[PDB]
Design a protein that fits this description.
This is part of a larger assembly, with chains A (about 110 residues), B (about 180 residues), C (about 140 residues), D (about 300 residues) and E (about 190 residues).
Chain A: H1 7-34, E1 41-42, H2 46-69, H3 76-99
Chain C: H1 32-43, E1 61-66, E2 72-78, E3 81-88, H2 96-100, H3 109-113, H4 121-135
Chain D: H1 4-39, H2 45-55, H3 67-83, H4 104-112, H5 114-123, H6 127-144, H7 147-158, H8 163-169, H9 180-193, H10 219-243, H11 254-275, H12 281-291, H13 293-309
Helix pairs in contact in D: 1-10, 3-4, 3-5, 3-10, 5-6, 6-9, 7-9, 7-13, 9-10, 10-11
Classes of the chains: A mainly alpha (about 110), B mainly alpha (about 180), C alpha+beta (about 140), D mainly alpha (about 300), E alpha/beta (about 190).
Bound molecules: iron/sulfur cluster (SF4).
PDB class: proton transport
Keywords: Complex I, Quinone, proton transport
Entry title: Complex I from E. coli, DDM-purified, with NADH, Resting state
């Protein structure tokens, strides 16, 4: 909205804050550059495993992100479905613990 | 706030156009990151705050992270394909782009002619999405949890090394 | 019948033999041209690396120079696990013995201190005892 | 062309620049204090002298590297955790972002923060720094995976993302005592995302890996340093406004109370830096998955049960 | 006092006066730049044989704008010293610890370069087998004074692109009175 004369002030402040932080960083780099004077292999699969754990548990976390807003608007049936969601999530988690995908062991 | 939507859409189109026709993939992933940022700005311009929040939380915060992980992991620099430059030639670039432009022309002919009340304000809060997502969509979240579990299980089964060490050479068929 | 018989204290681009009596035990004039040759050699050491002069076995095997003191140790890699290594030494060569042929029996005591700096007096003990054996001195 | 609406919006702009300058200054003051009260185990002009030196130095661009992402990684490391502070209220009328998604924006910034390490590792044409950036990115992903759940504890107790709603739902009791598990998990996750001392130099357990901070010189490394410190002070501000009382106090002014509690968290961070030794990598991963994520999931379940039990 | 100008070991140096005696805003801003470079000095202690371990009791390159050459100048390690010198970025300063970095330093032999003075410029020398950490600290103060009285180009675009090193009075002439005016010392038969 652009007509409530206080949230539009907050929007202007937010946009100016963003653009002036970016401008401050740009001008700091510009001052660093201008002033001062001049003169095969492969990593692993465990990094992929932990990043895949991050993204999969992140989507299973965004489901709880959506749930946590309506935690009191929804009833106990919402608690039951979130409980079985977290239960199967922890079942997969303890599967990853007990198999050994979640350990490093250097 | 329609000007922000137009600017975000234009720079999203330009960013994904530079994604399609770039040589090395790290700048392609960076352009796709700013394309996802522009798509999130489009989401914020249409009142879908939770959608853009999930776009930079997950789509620009977990998926591109995984792509950059793989790129910096197996040390690909686009080599042995970037010396060919086959996608900067008419015989490869003209055909499929013509086919996709025909698809675009017919689908935007399908877009036009529909009645349009127009995009209004009243942004959809994440609270309403939480009510609907754990309301009529219980089976959606449970079976999507099982979908993510299945994807985790498969990519663990396929993308595990079974070797040792944090540095491994690209040996043919892993001996 | 010696594998990889090469210079261990001096670089391979060294003409004379230092501990020979005809070799002068003095620092010659420092030419920057030789130092630039050695800098260029250090720049292309990993590029023109030939693992036959080092006494190495010629796809996993990756050759790298790993730079108490400081010394290089070349390493042959099967991934992370290490299969062969020749520690390159001689980077701290002070010529203590060749200066022993130069200093007298009394002026060489600091040079006996400076071979092992943590020991010091422990390291000037054996020279003093051997010198007393030569002189026939029984200390009280 | 003076109008009251223009006066109000210009005052809001001035307040935004004031809070930006004061958070940069307080991050630099955190740097100066971390220099000061570590040696005991005016002097503030050495900070300005160091800034003058880093400004007046010759920059390096590596001849084999690419300019844009090598110079854009410090941009991410600075401004992502800088604009993470825009959501934090310091007073009833001194906030710059009153948006509906009050903490999801911090989650966006924390998700984007790993690209600084990734781009540093790729642009720095050095395989050891690349491996160290790989390890650091894996660490911050494995420890940011539960940051969202540790914050959903407070969101589930309050009912909305907005920070004003958090500090108005904390009007009777502060959130640290009902959710202490959420407090400690959020503190650990904020330390690890910010790449502070216990989760610092993950390349220390290996010698084929070096830090991603190398191959930078001058203002780029300086930007990395001050970006880490604005990140830790905005994590302190988020922690106080989400678990302690946001600008809430008996007699002192609300902004004074918020600054005092933020500095209290800063001295606590200095203390936990001085006390706890560095663990190695394997218990870092093992803890950050096995002990951290089931505990915050159980915390979310228990807080759901107790807020639905007393539902009237 | 008068300065030497280096402009674009084998280069030529000439002894001229400082350009600040020829503007008032440039004088104080150059003073602030020299103050900032003087107060915050980041060292790169080079790891060598037996002066490096002595200053241990007292970081990565290219952020440390200062090199402290400690040990003996070996002919194999001299290219490493020069390469690590060209790694660092202008402005850079050199402190030599021990006799082995100033001169040959008890090793006038085939495998020892007679100091780093042969191939890199040195700002501050410290004499003697291993100097005390307090000697290193007093060399730091002396070099801070030398940096504080300097005239370097503030930018590579506008201004004189030449470095002006000050001719400091030598420490033996400055401290001559307090050294010659020493009458008696403690006998070495006690502690
Ligand atoms: S001056 Fe003495 S302590 Fe220092 S490097 Fe030379 S021999 Fe070693």
């Amino acid at each position: 909205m652009s007509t409530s004369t206080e949230v539009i002030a907050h929007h202007w402040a937010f946009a100016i804050f963003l653009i002036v932080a970016i401008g401050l960083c740009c001008l700091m780099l510009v001052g660093g550059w201008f002033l001062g004077g001049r003169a095969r292999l492969r990593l692993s699969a465990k990094f992929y495993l932990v990043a895949m754990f991050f993204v999969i548990f992140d989507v299973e976390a965004l489901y709880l992100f959506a749930w946590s807003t309506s935690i009191r608007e929804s009833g106990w049936v919402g608690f039951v479905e979130a409980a079985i969601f977290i239960f199967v999530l922890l079942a997969g988690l303890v599967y990853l613990v007990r198999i050994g995908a979640l350990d490093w062991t250097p | 706030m329609e000007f922000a939507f137009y600017i975000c859409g234009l720079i999203a189109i330009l960013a994904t156009l530079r994604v399609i026709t770039h040589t090395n993939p790290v700048h392609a992933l960076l352009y796709l990151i700013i394309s996802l940022l522009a798509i999130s700005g489009v989401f914020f311009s249409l009142g879908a705050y939770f959608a853009g929040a999930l776009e930079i939380i997950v789509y620009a915060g977990a998926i591109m992270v995984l792509f950059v992980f793989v790129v910096m992991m197996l040390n690909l620099g686009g080599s042995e394909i970037e010396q060919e430059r086959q996608w900067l030639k008419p015989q490869v670039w003209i055909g499929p782009a013509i086919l996709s432009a025909i698809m675009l022309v017919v689908i935007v002919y399908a877009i036009l002619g529909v009645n349009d009340q127009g995009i209004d304000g009243t942004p959809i809060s994440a609270k309403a999405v939480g009510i609907t997502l754990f309301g009529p969509y219980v089976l959606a979240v449970e079976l999507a949890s099982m979908l993510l579990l299945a994807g985790l299980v498969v990519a663990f089964h396929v993308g595990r090394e079974e070797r040792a060490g944090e540095v491994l050479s690209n040996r043919k068929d892993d001996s | 019948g010696h594998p990889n018989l090469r210079r261990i204290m001096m670089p391979q681009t060294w003409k004379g033999h230092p501990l020979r009596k005809d070799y002068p035990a003095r620092a010659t004039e420092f030419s920057p041209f030789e130092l630039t040759k050695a800098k260029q050699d250090l720049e292309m050491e990993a590029l023109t690396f030939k693992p036959e002069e080092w006494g190495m076995k010629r796809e996993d095997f990756m050759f790298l120079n790993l730079g108490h003191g400081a010394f290089r140790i070349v390493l042959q890699l099967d991934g992370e696990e290490i299969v062969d290594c020749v520690p390159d030494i001689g980077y701290h060569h002070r010529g203590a013995e060749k200066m022993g042929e130069r200093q007298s029996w009394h002026s060489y005591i600091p040079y006996t201190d400076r071979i092992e700096y943590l020991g010091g007096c422990v390291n000037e003990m054996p020279y003093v005892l051997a010198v007393e054996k030569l002189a026939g001195i029984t200390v009280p | 062309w003076i109008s009251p609406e223009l006066i109000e919006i210009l005052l809001t702009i001035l307040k935004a620049v004031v809070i930006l300058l004061v958070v940069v200054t307080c991050g630099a003051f955190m740097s100066f204090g971390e220099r000061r009260l570590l040696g005991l185990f005016g002097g503030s002009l050495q900070l300005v002298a160091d800034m003058i030196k880093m400004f007046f130095k010759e920059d390096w661009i590596p001849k084999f590297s690419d300019r844009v992402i090598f110079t854009l990684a410090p941009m991410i490391a600075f401004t992502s955790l800088l604009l993470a502070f825009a959501i934090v209220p310091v007073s009833p009328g001194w906030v710059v972002a009153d948006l509906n998604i009050g903490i999801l924006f911090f989650l966006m910034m924390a998700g984007l923060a790993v690209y600084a390490v990734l781009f540093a590792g790729w642009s720095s044409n050095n395989k050891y720094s690349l491996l160290g950036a790989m390890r650091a990115s894996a660490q911050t992903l494995s420890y940011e995976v539960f940051l969202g759940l540790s914050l959903m504890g407070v969101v589930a107790q309050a009912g909305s993302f907005n920070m004003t709603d958090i500090v108005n739902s904390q009007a009777h009791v502060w959130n640290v005592i009902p959710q202490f598990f959420g407090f400690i998990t959020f503190a650990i996750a904020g330390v690890a995302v910010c790449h502070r001392h216990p989760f610092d130099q993950p390349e220390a357990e290996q010698e084929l890996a070096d830090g991603y901070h190398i191959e930078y010189s001058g203002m780029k490394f300086g930007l990395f340093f001050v970006g880490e410190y604005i990140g830790i002070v905005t994590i302190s501000a988020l922690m106080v406004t989400l678990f302690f009382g946001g600008w809430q106090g008996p007699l002192l002014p609300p902004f004074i109370w918020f600054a005092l509690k933020t500095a209290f968290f800063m001295m606590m961070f200095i203390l936990i830096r001085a006390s706890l030794p560095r663990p190695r990598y394997d218990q870092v991963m093992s803890f950050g998955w096995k002990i951290c994520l089931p505990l915050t999931l159980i915390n979310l379940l228990v807080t759901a049960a107790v807020i639905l039990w007393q539902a009237q | 006092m008068d300065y030497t100008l280096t402009r674009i070991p084998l280069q030529k140096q000439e002894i001229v006066t400082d350009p600040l005696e020829q503007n008032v805003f440039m004088g104080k801003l150059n003073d602030m730049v020299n103050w900032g470079r003087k107060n915050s000095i980041w060292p790169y202690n080079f790891g060598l044989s037996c002066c490096y371990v002595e200053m241990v009791t007292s970081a990565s390159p290219r952020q440390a704008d200062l090199m402290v050459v400690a040990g003996t100048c070996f002919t194999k390690m001299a290219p490493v010293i020069q390469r690590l010198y060209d790694q660092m970025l202008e402005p850079k300063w050199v402190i030599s610890m021990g006799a082995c970095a100033n001169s040959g330093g008890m090793y006038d032999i085939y495998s020892v370069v007679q100091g780093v003075d042969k191939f890199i410029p040195v700002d501050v020398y410290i004499p003697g087998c291993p100097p005390r950490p307090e000697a290193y600290m007093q060399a730091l103060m002396l070099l801070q004074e030398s940096i504080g009285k300097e005239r370097r180009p503030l930018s590579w675009v506008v201004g004189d692109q030449g470095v002006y090193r000050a001719n400091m009075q030598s420490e033996r002439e400055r401290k001559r009175g307090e050294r010659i005016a020493v009458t008696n010392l403690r006998t070495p038969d006690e502690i």
